[PDB]
C-alpha cells in the first residue's frame, strides 16, 4: 500500500500508521554542533566473524540481504546497548542522483546512499516481539559516498540482475558483512524508530561517523532495480529514502570528541 511515489510516499503515511507524527521518528538530521560527547559509551563491539547469509530479496522497497538469526552468530554489544543483538539482514536506502539518497543527514549534507544493519535483542525471543519494545532494535547505520568502488560491495551489485523485481529472491551464501565496514567504528546515537511502515519507536540508532566508498558503476546498479514485480509497469527504484524527521526532545550522542 505505502510507498515513495508521490501519491504514497512517506507524507501520506501517517493516515495508516499514525505513529508516523510520533516524538521518537526517524531518521534526523545530525547537527554535530548540538550532539554531546558522552566518554561513558563504550566502544561497539561488531561480531561478524561467525555470520550466516542466506538469501537477497528484492521486497518492492529495497532489497535485503537476510542472515541465519536462530543463534547467537553474529552480533552487536556494547555501545549504547545493554546486551546482545543478532544481526537478521542488511539493506540500503538511495537516491536517483548522487547528491541525495541517504536518510540520515550530517549538518545536513545528504550522502548518495545508507546501508542499514538490522539487529534484534536476544533478550526479547524473536525479532517480531523484538519490535514492540522500545529497546528491541539496534540498527548500525553507514553513509556510501561516491568515489572508488567497494570490493567488499561488487558481490552485492553483482547478484541484483537476478532479484531486479519485486518478490524475486536468490541464494547469496557466504557473504562477509565485515567488508561494509569502514576503518573507524566511530559514531553518533539517539533513540528513534524504523525509517519504513510500521515506523515502531524500537530502535536504538548506531550512526558512523566514517562513510564507505562505493564507485559511480555500483550505485547505478542499484538504481536499476524496479519497485514493480515483473510483468507490471516498470517503476525504477529510487529515492526510496524517508526525509529528516524533527529530532523534539532527543540527544544525540557522539562516541569520539
Ligand atoms: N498511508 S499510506 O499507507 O501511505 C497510503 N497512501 C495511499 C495512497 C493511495 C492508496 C493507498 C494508500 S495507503
Ligand atoms: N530502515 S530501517 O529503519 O532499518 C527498517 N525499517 C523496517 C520496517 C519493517 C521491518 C524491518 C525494518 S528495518
Ligand atoms: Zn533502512
Same mark, same amino acid.
Given at each position: 500500500?505505502?510507498?515513495? /511515489? ?21 531518521? !534526523? ?24 547469509? %542466506? ?15 536462530? *543463534? ?8 549504547? #546497548?545493554?546486551?546482545?543483538?543478532? %544481526? ?6 538511495? $537516491?536517483?542522483?548522487? @547528491? ?5 543527514? !550530517? ?9 542499514? %544493519? ?9 525479532? @517480531? ?6 529497546? /528491541?532494535?539496534? !540498527?548500525? /547505520? ?9 570490493? $567488499? %560491495? ?26 561494509? #565496514? ?9 533513540? @528513534? ?24 558503476? *555500483? !550505485?547505478?546498479?542499484?538504481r536499476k532495480?524496479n519497485?514493480? @514485480?515483473?510483468?507490471?509497469?516498470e517503476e525504477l527504484m529510487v ?19
Amino acid at each position: 500500500h505505502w510507498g515513495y /511515489g508521490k501519491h504514497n510516499g512517506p507524507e501520506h503515511w501517517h493516515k495508516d500508521f499514525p505513529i508516523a507524527k510520533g516524538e521518537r521518528q526517524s531518521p !534526523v538530521d545530525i547537527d554535530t554542533h548540538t550532539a554531546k560527547y558522552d566518554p561513558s559509551l563504550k566502544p561497539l563491539s561488531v561480531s561478524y566473524d561467525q555470520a550466516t547469509s %542466506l538469501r537477497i530479496l528484492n521486497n518492492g522497497h529495497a532489497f535485503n540481504v537476510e542472515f541465519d538469526d536462530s *543463534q547467537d552468530k553474529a552480533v552487536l554489544k556494547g555501545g549504547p #546497548l545493554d546486551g546482545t543483538y543478532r %544481526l537478521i539482514q542488511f539493506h540500503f536506502h538511495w $537516491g536517483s542522483l548522487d @547528491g541525495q539518497g541517504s536518510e540520515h543527514t !550530517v549538518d545536513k549534507k545528504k550522502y548518495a546512499a545508507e546501508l542499514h %544493519l538490522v539487529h534484534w535483542n536476544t533478550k526479547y525471543g524473536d525479532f @517480531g516481539k523484538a519490535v514492540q519494545q522500545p529497546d /528491541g532494535l539496534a !540498527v548500525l /547505520g553507514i553513509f556510501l559516498k561516491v568515489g572508488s568502488a567497494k570490493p $567488499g %560491495l561488487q558481490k552485492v551489485v553483482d547478484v541484483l540482475d537476478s532479484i531486479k523485481t519485486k518478490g524475486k529472491s536468490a541464494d547469496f551464501t557466504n557473504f562477509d558483512p565485515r567488508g561494509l #565496514l569502514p576503518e573507524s567504528l566511530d559514531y553518533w546515537t539517539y533513540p @528513534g524508530s524504523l525509517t519504513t511502515p510500521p515506523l515502531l519507536e524500537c530502535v536504538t540508532w548506531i550512526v558512523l561517523k566514517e562513510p564507505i566508498s562505493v564507485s559511480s558503476e *555500483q !550505485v547505478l546498479k542499484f538504481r536499476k532495480l524496479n519497485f514493480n @514485480g515483473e510483468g507490471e509497469p516498470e517503476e525504477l527504484m529510487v529515492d526510496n529514502w524517508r526525509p529528516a524527521q524533527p529530532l523534539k526532545n532527543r540527544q544525540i550522542k557522539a562516541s569520539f570528541k
